[PDB]
């Protein structure tokens, strides 16, 4: 299935603070009102990573508990698995295959930490897996929000595909990033309060110019 992005997926591109200053930048980003792939759990198939992955999932019980990020995803590559068990967000790159039905009940890296909304943006530059994420309770919310880089992985590990995971003893949305020019609204306390995608409409280019 498919739906609309609804001005979501905007993250902080730089750590520059600006107070009441409108700043324009070019970076890989989700396009505004872009088409995002929708799957409802009855499935969790294998999808390509492309240049970037935008992820959004709204579950009250958080049925989605894990993701796996690997090039071939058949224990032939260092598949980055990010699985949240209990309150501990656990990140590993093991070459051990998971269960036959992918649900929760060579590990060169280990990090251990519809009410609820979780938004994610994944991209991989020079091996550093960059995750812009947000967790807050509330298809997609229409209001604007700014995603923060909650974690930035120093793993240095090449990834070209991904697959989400479930848990048993969920509606999620998958989008792809694009090179787009934005205009960003930094408020008095540096929070990005508004965003304009220049490659959307001519009013947006007039605001960008």
């Amino acid at each position: 299935a498919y739906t609309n992005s609804f001005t979501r997926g905007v993250y902080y591109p730089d750590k520059v603070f600006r107070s009441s200053v409108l700043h324009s930048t070019q970076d890989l980003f989700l396009p505004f009102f872009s088409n995002v792939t929708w799957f409802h759990v009855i499935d969790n198939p294998v999808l390509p990573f492309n240049d970037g992955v935008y992820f959004a999932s709204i579950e009250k019980s958080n049925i989605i508990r894990g993701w796996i990020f690997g090039t071939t995803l058949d224990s032939k590559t260092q598949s980055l698995l990010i699985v949240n068990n209990a309150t501990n967000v656990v990140i590993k790159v093991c070459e051990f295959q998971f269960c036959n039905d992918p649900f929760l009940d060579n590990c060169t890296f280990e990090y251990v930490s519809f009410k609820n909304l979780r938004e994610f943006v994944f991209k991989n530059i020079d091996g550093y897996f960059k995750i812009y994420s947000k967790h807050t309770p509330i298809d997609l919310p229409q209001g604007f929000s700014a995603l923060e880089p909650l974690v930035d992985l120093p793993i240095g590990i090449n990834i070209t595909r991904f697959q989400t995971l479930l848990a048993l003893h969920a509606a999620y949305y998958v989008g792809y990033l694009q090179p787009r020019t934005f205009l960003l609204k930094y408020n008095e306390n540096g929070t990005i309060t508004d965003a304009v995608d220049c490659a959307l409409d001519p009013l947006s280019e007039t605001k960008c110019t």
Partner: protein
């Protein structure tokens, strides 16, 4: 360096002016924000008969 009370976001290590000149930094020893103003100068004029 000043006794600034600027409030930064926790990921934001630096800041810039309207002309993108760096005006405030996050000190690694003390995570409060210090505004940076480079030192005074000016032209020199000689008033003489």
């Amino acid at each position: 360096l000043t006794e600034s009370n600027k409030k930064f976001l926790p990921f934001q290590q630096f800041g810039r002016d309207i002309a993108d000149t760096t005006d405030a930094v996050r000190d690694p020893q003390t995570l409060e924000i210090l505004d940076i103003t480079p030192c005074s100068f000016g032209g020199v004029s000689v008033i003489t008969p």
